[PDB]
Design a protein around this ligand. Structure first.
Ligand SMILES: O=C(N/N=C/c1cccs1)C1CC1
Lengths: 300, 237
């Protein structure tokens, strides 16, 4: 088990850790989060009591170093930082635990939710989408735009998702216009899987990270990226059978974890109706179709 | 953007543009089989690609053989149209390639766009206008060349005959759409009006009779007149 201590909590803020969250009061003696499960990525995220817009947060992996949080009164945000002095850090952690000023990562032992949402997400791939290589952890917020969004302004702050475009030369082989546009299999399997992602796990990984950014940060272009990567698979007549079954599990747990009140801002009607009911793979997402119908029949 | 009544005079500026209509590309007759089921037989069709400023018509004849052994023919029709439009633009010298292509039916957008990926600077646009180009096969000489064709074939026409020697593009296009509208809503009567007088002939290199200016005025009034009578009959107004 690992720990992310907090120096202080000077401003009222709702703190998220993965799918859990806690309200902390201005200058409440809060000093961090303990018992964080090793083995998966994690995200710690903040919504100030006074700015209900701007969500923001840090993706990290406790194996890659000792990380803590410190409010910066100049820039006005809780900042993640790395402590290189291992001894100094165990010392801070131990003292705060002794004083019991830390909340416990509240995992139910039956619950594989976070594993299921993060199965293919790897810290190394996150740091390629969020390029800032002086840090081991990755800052994402509500306002950050994607590279594809930027092509249609500041590139240092961009989400470098892999660009998917169904009406591009990349996606359409000359002489197979109609075929490739109606049946994206060659774009999925040769261009994206074999070409760019190298394997389905990296693709699922980006798909999942995009989802999480979409629902935890309210990041619009992440939601666009998640839907595009779903649509590419569902609009391909030829998908490896192992990908279809893994996809149905992946989407099931994403829909399951979805805030019911944001179902209409986070799920694109067209894409979902096409994947579940029109596409080549309409019959291959039974678990996903069953939870969508019982929980959001309106969207369909 | 979409083409509508507001931005209608843009048709007659000096930016090259083409209208593409696919309504006559895949044509069938429906008939009964010996066992009493229904079957279609295809007949030859055409892509109606028109420069509204110049009157140049690129009538690409679609021979039934194109359909042989193919499924989902109405969907394929849209892709074949786009493939042929694209081939037409590639065939044209650079200074003659259009800056816009305006499809008369929105279902052509994705196919043309995909086929025109090599021409990112050509804008594919829909239209909100209700253009009567489907009636192009009511023009006897165009129907005749389509139906006689034994192979794919491009045939070039000026759909304005020599009118531009005497009227603007704006006026020529209004006359053409008026005639085609009339031919659409009541072919028999429209054709009667055009040909009633045996002393007004069609030149061998023309599509329409050689009306004088005053006779065109009368003809247009007769066409107007027909279209509003028909609207009266059709809506019991
Ligand atoms: O337009 C959006 N609003 N999202 C709001 C959120 C606030 C907090 C979590 S999601 C994003 C697509 C989801």
């Amino acid at each position: 088990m690992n720990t992310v201590p907090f120096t202080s909590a000077p401003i009222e803020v709702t703190i998220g850790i993965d799918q859990y969250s806690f309200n902390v009061k201005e200058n409440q003696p809060f000093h961090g989060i303990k018992d964080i499960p090793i083995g998966h990525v994690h995200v710690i995220h903040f919504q100030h009591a006074d700015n209900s817009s701007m969500r923001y947060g840090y993706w990290f992996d406790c194996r890659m170093g000792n990380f803590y949080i410190q409010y910066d009164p100049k820039d006005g945000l809780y900042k993640m930082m790395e402590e290189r002095d291992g001894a100094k850090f165990e010392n801070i952690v131990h003292n705060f635990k002794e004083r019991q000023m830390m909340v416990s990562y509240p995992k139910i032992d039956e619950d594989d939710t976070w594993y299921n949402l993060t199965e293919f997400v790897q810290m190394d791939k996150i740091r390629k989408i969020v390029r800032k290589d002086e840090n081991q952890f990755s800052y994402v917020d509500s306002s950050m735009t994607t590279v594809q969004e930027n092509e249609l302004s500041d590139p240092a702050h961009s989400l470098n998702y892999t660009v998917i475009n169904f009406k591009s030369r990349e996606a359409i082989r000359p002489g197979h216009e109609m075929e490739d546009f109606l049946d994206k299999s060659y774009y999925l399997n040769t261009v994206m899987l074999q070409g760019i992602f190298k394997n389905s796990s990296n693709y699922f990984g980006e798909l999942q990270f995009a989802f999480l950014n979409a629902m935890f940060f309210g990041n619009y272009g992440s939601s666009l990226q998640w839907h595009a990567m779903i649509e590419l698979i569902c609009s391909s007549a030829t998908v490896p059978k192992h990908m279809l079954d893994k996809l149905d599990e992946i989407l099931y747990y994403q829909i399951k974890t979805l805030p019911e009140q944001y179902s209409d801002i986070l799920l694109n009607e067209r894409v979902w109706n096409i994947c579940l009911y029109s596409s080549f793979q309409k019959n291959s997402l039974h678990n996903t179709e069953k939870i969508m119908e019982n929980k959001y029949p309106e969207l369909l | 953007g979409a083409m509508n009544s507001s931005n209608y005079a843009e048709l007659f500026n000096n930016d090259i543009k083409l209208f593409v209509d696919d309504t006559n590309v895949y044509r069938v007759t429906v008939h009964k089989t010996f066992e009493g089921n229904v079957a279609t037989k295809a007949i030859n069709g055409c892509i109606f690609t028109l420069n509204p400023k110049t009157g140049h018509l690129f009538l690409k004849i679609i021979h039934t053989s194109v359909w042989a052994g193919q499924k989902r023919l109405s969907q394929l029709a849209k892709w074949k149209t786009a493939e042929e439009v694209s081939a037409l633009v590639r065939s044209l010298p650079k200074e003659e390639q259009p800056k816009q292509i305006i499809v008369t039916r929105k279902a052509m957008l994705d196919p043309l766009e995909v086929h025109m990926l090599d021409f990112p600077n050509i804008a594919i646009r829909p239209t909100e206008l209700r253009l009567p180009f489907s009636a192009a096969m009511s023009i006897d000489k165009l129907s005749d060349v389509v139906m006689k064709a034994t192979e794919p074939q491009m045939v070039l026409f000026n759909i304005y005959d020599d009118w531009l020697d005497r009227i603007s593009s704006y006026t020529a296009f209004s006359r053409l759409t008026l005639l085609l509208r009339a031919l659409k809503t009541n072919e028999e009567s429209a054709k009667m009006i055009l040909l009633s007088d045996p002393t007004i002939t069609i030149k061998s290199y023309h599509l329409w009779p050689s009306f004088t200016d005053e006779q065109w005025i009368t003809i247009e009034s007769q066409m107007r007149d027909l279209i509003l009578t028909e609207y009266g009959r059709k809506y019991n107004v």
